[PDB]
Design an enzyme around this catalytic site. Structure first.
Site, mmCIF file in Angstrom:
data_model
loop_
_atom_site.group_PDB
_atom_site.id
_atom_site.type_symbol
_atom_site.label_atom_id
_atom_site.label_comp_id
_atom_site.label_asym_id
_atom_site.label_seq_id
_atom_site.Cartn_x
_atom_site.Cartn_y
_atom_site.Cartn_z
ATOM 1 C CB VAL A 1 -0.975 0.411 1.024
ATOM 2 C CG1 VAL A 1 -1.985 -0.440 0.949
ATOM 3 C CG2 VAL A 1 -0.156 -0.511 2.501
ATOM 4 N N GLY A 2 2.055 1.058 -0.108
ATOM 5 C CA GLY A 2 3.308 2.739 0.444
ATOM 6 C C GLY A 2 3.488 2.884 1.068
ATOM 7 N N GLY B 1 5.952 3.329 4.934
ATOM 8 C CA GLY B 1 4.454 4.496 6.234
ATOM 9 C C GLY B 1 6.283 4.665 7.165
ATOM 10 C CB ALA B 2 6.864 6.102 9.856
ATOM 11 C CE1 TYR B 3 11.755 6.640 11.135
ATOM 12 C CE2 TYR B 3 10.405 6.209 12.886
ATOM 13 C CZ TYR B 3 10.905 6.882 12.172
ATOM 14 O OH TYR B 3 11.271 8.050 13.233
ATOM 15 C CB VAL C 1 2.348 -0.141 5.132
ATOM 16 C CG1 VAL C 1 0.811 -0.402 6.081
ATOM 17 C CG2 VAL C 1 3.162 1.005 5.878
ATOM 18 C CG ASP D 1 3.141 8.361 10.398
ATOM 19 O OD1 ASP D 1 2.915 7.358 10.908
ATOM 20 O OD2 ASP D 1 3.420 8.724 9.435
HETATM 21 C C1 LIG Z 1 0.094 -0.118 9.690
HETATM 22 C C2 LIG Z 1 1.356 1.006 11.068
HETATM 23 C C3 LIG Z 1 1.640 1.225 11.699
HETATM 24 C C4 LIG Z 1 1.831 2.519 12.310
HETATM 25 C C5 LIG Z 1 1.856 3.394 12.156
HETATM 26 C C6 LIG Z 1 1.672 4.977 13.030
HETATM 27 O O1 LIG Z 1 1.348 5.783 13.209
HETATM 28 N N1 LIG Z 1 3.121 4.870 14.259
HETATM 29 C C7 LIG Z 1 3.644 6.410 14.605
HETATM 30 C C8 LIG Z 1 2.243 6.596 15.559
HETATM 31 C C9 LIG Z 1 3.878 5.355 15.787
HETATM 32 C C10 LIG Z 1 0.431 3.931 11.010
HETATM 33 C C11 LIG Z 1 0.257 2.621 10.126
HETATM 34 C C12 LIG Z 1 -0.562 2.789 9.507
HETATM 35 C C13 LIG Z 1 -2.322 2.510 9.827
HETATM 36 C C14 LIG Z 1 -3.022 2.860 8.759
HETATM 37 C C15 LIG Z 1 -2.849 2.851 7.556
HETATM 38 C C16 LIG Z 1 -3.295 3.691 6.744
HETATM 39 O O2 LIG Z 1 -4.569 3.493 6.751
HETATM 40 N N2 LIG Z 1 -3.776 3.524 5.640
HETATM 41 C C17 LIG Z 1 -4.095 3.491 4.400
HETATM 42 C C18 LIG Z 1 -4.073 5.075 3.922
HETATM 43 C C19 LIG Z 1 -4.852 6.279 4.645
HETATM 44 C C20 LIG Z 1 -5.129 6.076 2.684
HETATM 45 C C21 LIG Z 1 -1.477 3.143 7.010
HETATM 46 N N3 LIG Z 1 -0.853 2.788 8.090
#
Ligand SMILES: Cc1ccc(C(=O)NC2CC2)cc1-c1ccc(C(=O)NCC2CC2)cn1
Length: 347
Positions: free
Chosen positions: A27-28, A30-32, A35, A165
């Site tokens: 899906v593209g 993410g932080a570090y 995903v 994030d």
């Molecule tokens: C898998 C994950 C792991 C960690 C953190 C995070 O926020 N970490 C920081 C807080 C510590 C966020 C995600 C996450 C959640 C939802 C989405 C999502 O919904 N993606 C789809 C995109 C929105 C269209 C994408 N990425």
């Protein structure tokens, strides 16, 4: 006991996850880490699975990994991303090397919403209310987002929103005509002083303005251009703000600028609900000591139709003393490992 794991190559890396997660699809980044969206057969939820890349490569990465896990394990609020699952295929500390974080998956971010839908004032109310409700919770645990922007606001089809994030960019990233800098409080964009949680309120002001007009509020072509756009709108700093800029260098530059009065917001935001204009005035204040807080903003009359003081929770105390601690890689790794093994699913 331990689930069965299966292997596959996604993103030219091997992903090893429990059978419950099916139909992994990239899906593209993410932080570090990268995903994948997936189907959680156990819960019937669409989930997002993040594989941290090289979690324990260096002290920086190792601390980083521990940081993110701690943050995710702690956050339990409807408007803040939380942790559905965390796993590693490792059967012991010795072979522990990969960390996977699982959260809800939302269908769009706010950037998508703003680009292709017409937002009515009621949409603006609800969306901003939820961002402010999530931030109250985050700020209550002494966590600062620092990089709040539409791309880290996830939103479902019902317009229900989660913040991602928080609590975690290089120079080149912040350079030029780029969204990575358009929502940043000036005190952090130009390193004016030790900043704090008020930086996130400026970001909200910028996002709210953009939901109201459909257009980026301060789309600078670089740091200086952006500062000029900001001061054009809010006025150049006064004597009192200046003294508080502890960077002598920054203070010196900013005083070189021709003084400018704050503009009339009702003239900048034509047609906007006067209450929305008032809140923007309270958020978009150059002096961070004087910006409205998330808790105060939730009580603003713009949110009268959503505000419920018995339903805007604070967080349990978050112990982040680890932040001031120096440890070796293996020490950060073992701390991480304990947090993986002690994870308990939400009910
Ligand atoms: C898998 C994950 C792991 C960690 C953190 C995070 O926020 N970490 C920081 C807080 C510590 C966020 C995600 C996450 C959640 C939802 C989405 C999502 O919904 N993606 C789809 C995109 C929105 C269209 C994408 N990425």
């Amino acid at each position: 006991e331990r689930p069965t794991f299966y292997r596959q190559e996604l993103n030219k890396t091997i992903w090893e996850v429990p059978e419950r997660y099916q139909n992994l699809s990239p899906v593209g980044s993410g932080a570090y880490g990268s995903v994948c969206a997936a189907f959680d057969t156990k819960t019937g939820l669409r989930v997002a699975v993040k594989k941290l890349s090289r979690p324990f490569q260096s002290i920086i990465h190792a601390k980083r990994t521990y940081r993110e896990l701690r943050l995710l394990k702690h956050m339990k609020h409807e408007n803040v991303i939380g942790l559905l699952d965390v796993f590693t295929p490792a059967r012991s500390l010795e072979e522990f090397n990969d960390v996977y974080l699982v959260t809800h998956l939302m269908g769009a971010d706010l950037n998508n919403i703003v680009k292709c839908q017409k937002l009515t004032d009621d949409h603006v109310q609800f969306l901003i209310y939820q961002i402010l409700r999530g931030l109250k919770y985050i700020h209550s645990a002494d966590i600062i987002h620092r990089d709040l922007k539409p791309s880290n606001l996830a939103v479902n089809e019902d317009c229900e929103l989660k913040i991602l994030d928080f609590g975690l960019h290089t120079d080149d990233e912040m350079t030029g005509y780029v969204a990575t800098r358009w929502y940043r409080a000036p005190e952090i964009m130009l390193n004016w002083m030790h900043y704090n949680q008020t930086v996130d309120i400026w970001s909200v002001g910028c996002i709210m303005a953009e939901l109201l007009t459909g257009r980026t509020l301060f789309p600078g072509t670089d740091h200086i251009d952006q500062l000029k756009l900001i001061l054009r709108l809010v006025g150049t700093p006064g004597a009192e703000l200046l003294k508080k800029i502890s960077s002598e260098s920054a203070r010196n530059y900013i005083q070189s600028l021709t003084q400018m009065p704050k503009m009339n917001f009702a003239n900048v935001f034509i047609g906007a609900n006067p209450l929305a204009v008032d809140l923007l005035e309270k958020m978009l204040v150059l002096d961070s000591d004087k910006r409205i807080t998330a808790a105060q903003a939730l009580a603003h009359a713009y949110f009268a139709q959503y505000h419920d003081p018995d339903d805007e929770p604070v967080a349990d105390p978050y112990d982040q003393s680890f932040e001031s601690r120096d440890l070796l890689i293996d020490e950060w790794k073992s701390l991480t490992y304990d947090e993986v093994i002690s994870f308990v699913p939400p009910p």
